[PDB]
Design a protein around this ligand. Structure first.
Ligand SMILES: Cc1ncc(C[n+]2csc(CCOP(=O)(O)OP(=O)(O)O)c2C)c(N)n1
Ligand SMILES: Cc1ncc(C[n+]2csc(CCOP(=O)(O)OP(=O)(O)O)c2C)c(N)n1
Ligand SMILES: [Mg+2]
Ligand SMILES: [Mg+2]
Lengths: 560, 557
């Protein structure tokens, strides 16, 4: 009893909960894609381009655990690379399958049209932004090679490149291979290295007078949210998230003290974290840097970083000591270690805006607080590079909120595709889960067509478009009135019906009363159709600590 | 007297006729961009994404001879890579300038892979560049900039120039701008050239059925007049590849149409495949396979004039340059071809038989009818899909500039190329029309670049072929597969949705409707941007594609 290697791919992807496939068809993947329609519960998104496809795969992988995008040799694969790179940078498990010319390599050479002298060139380009690669050449090893690529994607949480020649996808393999699951479990830690790490961490905890816990980008990605909650529970140490970590600590926890954004933190959060004599960083990735926007660092060097891959203690690096296992062992002994601790109180924010007149023009500082009233448990909140990403750091999340904000890679446009991916993933998880996008008017332009694919599948995101007449975040750094910071004015309300939407809402809000009227309405709160909310904001308006920091950078002689 | 390195770049660009700069701003290019406004006459396109900006730079370079796209470190530059690779594949001179971190911050996490390797993106682009520079020394920088510009224009392939943010604000003597960049070619080694010429002349002497074939680099490397003289003096049949269409002015009695290898017409296929010598001008590749056709010749007796070298049968003559070598050949070639006896060459109908105005539009009808609309000086842009194949049957007036990316074949390219070509055209002559045929499927990939056309008040004709999906793909495999289907868009609403105030958007479904629009005197003048949505059956295509589809249906039975 045999199945094609093509069918085998998708049956595997199904076993690991990948149901939606991203990409575009082309010369070398059409017979491959035919298998999707024969695998119960698999679908093909039908993306509007390959870059967006990759962004969407990234968004889907963030919620579901991994994802698969399929492109074609040359034109499709090169179009996806920025998506793939951002997934690599932010540790998101994206399987990138590339249909290539059939396997004296006459067919590859006739089809290979770059006119360089090398048909491996695209593979070699992808290698730079891939955990591993594979180019399948042999039917007899192909099943194992695909299993390895899927396992690696999942376990390492980084992109994997899989080249599938057209002629191999049609060859058959025994169906019975599917009856043995892909091993998705992490390799155990080294008992001796782990034990050393744990002993040192316990000793540092015993010795600290003002320890804090800092959840970062990989806390949730590597399945350590529970472990982290437990760490806060057993220690009672003040707990904070970085902007990439937001949602990884349920924010109603009594010990949750807010988001640490460096010099952009509230004064109290800044003092709370920067006064710490020990930092336990869980899922660390965002570890210390500089940007023309914000200066993230000024703490102690007494840090313990549980990275997914290794652990760092002050200066020492214990390679191969993995976060989740290392945390679990630490939990068996951490209550004792922290037994000597008197609970320093945590920073708090005002929970609501002050009441103002309904006529009041919308401003960002007000908006970001007010979003807190609309959010609910189970929401997915996506924020684009630009003022949105900075603004969301002040917003109060309910319990069980999944944040997506691409703080490290910072590719504007990402979020329209990420919204698509997340919405597919969220519908598979719970049809009641809402996906809420905040995207700038500038960023929207780069990837706007992926709205079309949301309509195509009857997906129901809230698309809050922030209309401030261009690239405000860039205006604040340089060229406040430069033509390169301006954009063509689009009719945002007309986007949905221009892409064929029949069942949608498109509304513009310019005031506090308008915002409230829309967002407190019970019908709007139900995820019943796709909606675009156009939010009219002043061009130089931005979250306050950002504005203050912009005035700082501009005053100082410190530079690049 | 001193100017910034940034200002120097843009002044050097102005001297080589680059007036519009493509790209998107970002973290390490903002101070660079400031310089644009300091240089009289230069402008920043303001593109809607970096992929489209690369597609636009490519269209711009095709018309003006070279272009410049500027992107930001990591996120900008990697978005543009498919645009660059296409310009590499088809020999288009695109300068990709990337604003990078200063050479003393590196010495950031935002937009890097997390490894501290700040060279990974430059190394990625080196694979699809003629050459690269990463500038680190203010003292050598003007020379490195000139080198990159020269190699871009001379080699007609992309060049990658990395510019650290600290370097752009540093100063260089303005006096350097007073000596031009040298863009000239050295003459050929006379020995090698004499050898190529005598060998080609013998081949002509001995050939019974020789043909001329002009490909893309005939135009790119400025061999059009030499190629015309070749046809005049020899009276040999003369064809173009799809990539080279427009390279031979089609009103020449010896022009026999377009050779598309296995997808050529019966008559063209036979005229080329029975040749006992092919004189190829500007071949990109004389051998390649597409998802749609096979391209090759029957004879081993192939002469290839390339920009960089010459090939005769299996022998290569490195450094024997097309233009100089063709000029030398023409002095002797009438004598070599003295015996040749002409004959009619193949042709396609110039006109359609009159039919009823209610006649629904079909592809075969439309591609011939386009010939009635075109005029001398037009730029005619066709997307990968049915359009690229149908245009091959359209008669081009003299001096028609075709853009059709048949070799790289990346759908979506033409939306950007149309922007780039429309800027370049406006710089050449505001009255030169830019005419695009793009499928509904390809439009989706790069649609937002319509916004940038509107922004600059550019006035292209955008013919959108609505056949409800990916028809070329349907004909190959998966006729009714969901992956060949697309979300249906309201094309007539694209222009106003992207902020167009002065535009037309019209839908044509019949022969009569087509004719009322295109014969309208006012329509024929490029007074405003236009979208024309052309309604076509789902499985309709030019008859070569239809024939191929029935061929593999009656077969595989
Ligand atoms: C692909 C890509 N191109 C360019 C940039 C540089 N960039 C960062 S923010 C930004 C402007 C964002 O504008 P908008 O979405 O309108 O945000 P806001 O006005 O709310 O700041 C740009 C161009 C980038 N990060 N990624
Ligand atoms: C960037 C890219 N992605 C995918 C492909 C594969 N491809 C070739 S033609 C085609 C369909 C084009 O459809 P459309 O523009 O509507 O043209 P039609 O054939 O219907 O006239 C596709 C998906 C490609 N060539 N380039
Ligand atoms: Mg904006
Ligand atoms: Mg189509």
């Amino acid at each position: 009893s045999e199945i094609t290697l093509g069918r085998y791919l998708f049956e595997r992807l199904k076993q690991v909960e990948v149901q939606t496939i991203f990409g575009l068809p082309g010369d070398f993947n059409l017979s491959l894609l035919d298998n999707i329609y024969e695998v119960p519960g698999m679908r093909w998104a039908g993306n509007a381009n390959e870059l967006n496809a990759a962004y969407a795969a990234d968004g889907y992988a963030r919620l579901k655990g991994m994802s698969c995008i399929i492109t074609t040799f040359g034109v499709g694969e090169l179009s996806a690379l920025n998506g793939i790179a951002g997934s690599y940078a932010e540790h998101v498990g994206v399987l990138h399958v590339v249909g290539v010319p059939s396997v004296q390599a006459k067919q590859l050479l006739l089809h290979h049209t770059l006119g360089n002298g090398d048909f491996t060139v695209f593979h070699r380009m992808s290698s730079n932004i891939s955990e591993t690669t594979a180019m399948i050449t042999d039917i007899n090893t192909a099943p194992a090679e695909i299993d390895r690529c899927i396992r690696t994607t999942y376990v390492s949480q980084r992109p994997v490149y899989l080249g599938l020649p057209a002629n191999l996808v049609d060859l058959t393999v025994p169906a019975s291979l599917l009856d043995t699951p892909i091993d998705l479990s992490l390799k155990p830690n080294d008992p001796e290295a782990e034990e050393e790490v744990i002993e040192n961490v316990l000793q540092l905890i015993k010795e600290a007078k003002n320890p804090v816990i800092l959840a970062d980008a990989c806390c949730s990605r590597h399945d350590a949210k529970a472990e982290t909650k437990k760490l806060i529970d057993l220690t009672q140490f003040p707990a904070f998230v970085t902007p990439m970590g937001k949602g990884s600590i349920d924010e109603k926890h009594p010990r949750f003290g807010g988001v640490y954004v460096g010099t952009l933190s509230s004064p109290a959060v800044k003092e709370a974290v920067e006064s710490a004599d020990l930092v336990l960083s869980v899922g660390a990735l965002l570890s210390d840097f500089n940007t023309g926007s914000f200066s993230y660092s000024y703490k102690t060097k007494n840090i313990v970083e549980f990275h997914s891959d290794y652990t760092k203690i002050r200066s020492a690096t214990f390679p191969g000591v993995q976060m989740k296992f290392a945390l679990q062992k630490l939990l068996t002994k951490v209550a004792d270690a922290a037994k000597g601790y008197k609970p320093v109180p945590v920073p708090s924010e005002p929970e609501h805006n002050e009441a103002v007149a309904d006529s009041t023009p919308l401003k960002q500082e007000w908006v970001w607080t007010q979003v807190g009233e609309f959010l609910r448990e189970g929401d997915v909140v996506i924020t684009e590079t630009g003022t949105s990403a900075f603004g969301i750091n002040q917003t109060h999340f309910p319990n069980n909120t999944y944040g997506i904000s691409q703080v490290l890679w910072g590719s504007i446009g990402f979020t329209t595709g990420a919204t698509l991916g997340a919405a597919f993933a969220a519908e598979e998880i719970d049809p009641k889960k809402r996906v809420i996008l905040f995207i700038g008017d500038g960023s929207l332009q780069l990837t706007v067509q992926e709205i079309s694919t949301m309509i195509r599948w009857g997906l129901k995101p809230y698309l809050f478009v922030l209309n401030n007449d261009g690239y405000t975040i860039e205006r604040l750094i340089h060229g406040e009135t430069a033509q390169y910071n301006c954009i063509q004015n689009w009719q945002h309300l007309e986007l949905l019906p221009t892409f064929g939407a029949k069942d949608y809402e498109a509304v513009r809000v310019s005031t506090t009363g308008e915002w409230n009227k829309l967002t407190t309405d019970e019908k709007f709160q139900d995820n019943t159709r796709i909606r675009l909310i156009e939010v009219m904001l002043p061009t130089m308006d931005a979250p306050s600590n950002l504005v203050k920091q912009a005035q700082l950078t501009a005053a100082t002689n410190a530079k690049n």
